[PDB]
């Protein structure tokens, strides 16, 4: 019924981003495969880089028997704390920041869909401002499909639309 502005859709189960359409023949959800797939490639790349790039050195540690030499003890103990502080703090914040970006990425992606559609329709539709478009002409399945394929023709529905505009004005 409403678009991305009011939230996401339980109904759409075949991808991340897509459309909901309304006409005389009926209604239904359809994921935009191309835009979804592109985002998936990218997120996988990000996650894999964060995981695969940690390729760490062969280490080994000592929990000794040792009120014997001390000065080295104390140095080893200070070093373990230092490393601990470094990884804990940095990687906490890393997750916080990377998560922020991921969510922004998805928001940016969805708005792009809306902007791409809007640019095709122009004044043949009315931007309801909730992520939906009210078309000023009748729209069969092939019309809807043309919009989803990015092949909708502005000129071909211009005339039917203009009459409807002036009817609104009267």
């Amino acid at each position: 019924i409403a678009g991305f502005i009011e939230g996401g859709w339980q109904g759409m189960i075949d991808g991340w981003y897509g459309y909901h359409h309304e006409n005389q023949e009926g209604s239904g959800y359809a994921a935009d495969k191309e835009a979804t797939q592109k985002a998936v490639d990218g997120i996988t790349n990000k996650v894999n880089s964060i995981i695969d790039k940690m390729n760490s050195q062969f280490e080994s540690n000592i929990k000794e028997f040792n009120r014997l030499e001390l000065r080295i003890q104390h140095l080893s103990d200070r070093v373990d704390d230092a490393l601990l502080d470094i990884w804990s703090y940095n990687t906490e914040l890393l997750v916080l920041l990377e998560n922020e970006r991921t969510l922004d990425f998805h928001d940016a992606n969805v708005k792009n869909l809306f902007e791409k559609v809007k640019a095709q329709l122009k004044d043949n539709a009315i931007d309801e401002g909730n992520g939906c478009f009210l078309l000023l002409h009748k729209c069969n399945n092939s019309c809807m499909d043309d919009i989803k394929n990015g092949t909708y023709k502005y000129m071909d529905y211009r005339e039917e639309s203009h009459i409807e505009k002036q009817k609104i004005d009267s």
């Binding site: 859709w9 991340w16 997750v95 998560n99 969805v110």
Partner: protein, 319 residues
């Protein structure tokens, strides 16, 4: 007639944290922090640990009569350490530089016992002397790898050991610290003695520390136990006029650089293999961080004090 632009929402209950919000529900996410072990001590890239069971490392290398079991482990990736292992030094004394010896033997590759001299070549001296405190089979004996030499009437005797290999040679020996001068003269035929290790130009002179200690295992004298590593193509010449418990057997070995280690663990050795080992068990280390244990051996995720680290992969799950 309408068309709307929208996004997925879902039944997934995972949440994640971000700079700007706490616990934001998402359609999908990924744990990048490993948080469970397998509760076993494993071999490490298919090389198993050294398991001395009831022996100490010192007991084993000296050739304590009670250690006469584990097979010649030709190699090992680290050492399982026992804190109270009964079979250690049978003749009471001190071990000099244990911590460095443990570090040296922490991970090693080819490890073969080798004979360093014949006592029955020697003249004007008694060899293979024996004591009750190191018993073989109810009968008194002595360390397998050391030879106790006596009765030289204050006269000097000699031993060249060689390392002809391109790898190091591990040596153990002892100096007998006698209880008084009376016993010093009885065994070695003089009031005072000297033992000298010659490594080309370098030298070391050991003299015994005479006097009576506490009686332990019927003894008021002691032995001081020493070790050394003899480098590739190298010779030492030993001259002594007494109190030397000599090195009869040694070990060729090769140390691995990112060297194995020492593990104190309650867990028993297992058939399993891993890339990363902790005192708590082993780790699936394909993840970049872990919170199981700070003390690890191998190729390990970094230790952090987080309880989890969720990476968002999906979208804000607001239906």
């Amino acid at each position: 007639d309408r068309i709307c632009i929208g996004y997925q929402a879902n039944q997934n209950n995972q949440t994640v944290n971000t700079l700007l919000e706490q616990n934001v529900p998402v359609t999908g996410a990924q744990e990048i922090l490993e948080t469970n072990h397998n509760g076993k001590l494993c071999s490490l890239n298919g090389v198993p640990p050294l398991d001395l069971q009831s022996c100490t490392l010192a007991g084993w290398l000296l050739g304590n009569p009670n250690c006469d079991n584990l097979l010649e482990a030709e190699e090992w990736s680290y050492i399982k350490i026992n804190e109270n292992a009964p079979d250690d030094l049978c003749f009471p004394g001190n071990f000099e530089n244990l911590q460095d010896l443990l570090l040296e033997m922490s991970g090693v590759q080819n490890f073969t016992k080798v004979k360093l001299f014949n006592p029955q070549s020697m003249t004007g001296v008694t060899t293979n002397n024996v004591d009750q405190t190191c018993p073989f089979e109810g009968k008194p004996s002595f360390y397998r790898n050391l030879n106790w030499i006596q009765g030289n009437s204050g006269l000097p005797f000699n031993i060249e050991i060689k390392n002809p290999t391109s790898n190091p040679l591990l040596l153990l020996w002892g100096i007998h610290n006698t209880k008084d001068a009376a016993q010093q003269r009885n065994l070695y035929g003089n009031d005072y003695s000297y033992t000298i290790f010659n490594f080309g130009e370098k030298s070391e002179e050991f003299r015994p520390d005479i006097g009576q200690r506490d009686e332990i295992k019927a003894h008021q004298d002691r032995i001081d136990y020493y070790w050394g590593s003899l480098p590739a193509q190298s010779t030492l010449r030993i001259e002594s006029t007494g109190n030397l418990i000599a090195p009869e057997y040694g070990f060729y070995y090769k140390r691995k650089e990112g060297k194995g280690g020492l593990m104190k663990s309650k867990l028993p050795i297992s058939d399993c293999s891993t890339k990363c080992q902790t005192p708590l068990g082993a780790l699936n280390s394909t993840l970049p961080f872990q919170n199981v244990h700070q003390q690890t051996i191998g190729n390990c995720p970094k230790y952090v004090k987080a309880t989890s680290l969720m990476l968002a992969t999906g979208l804000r799950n607001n239906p």
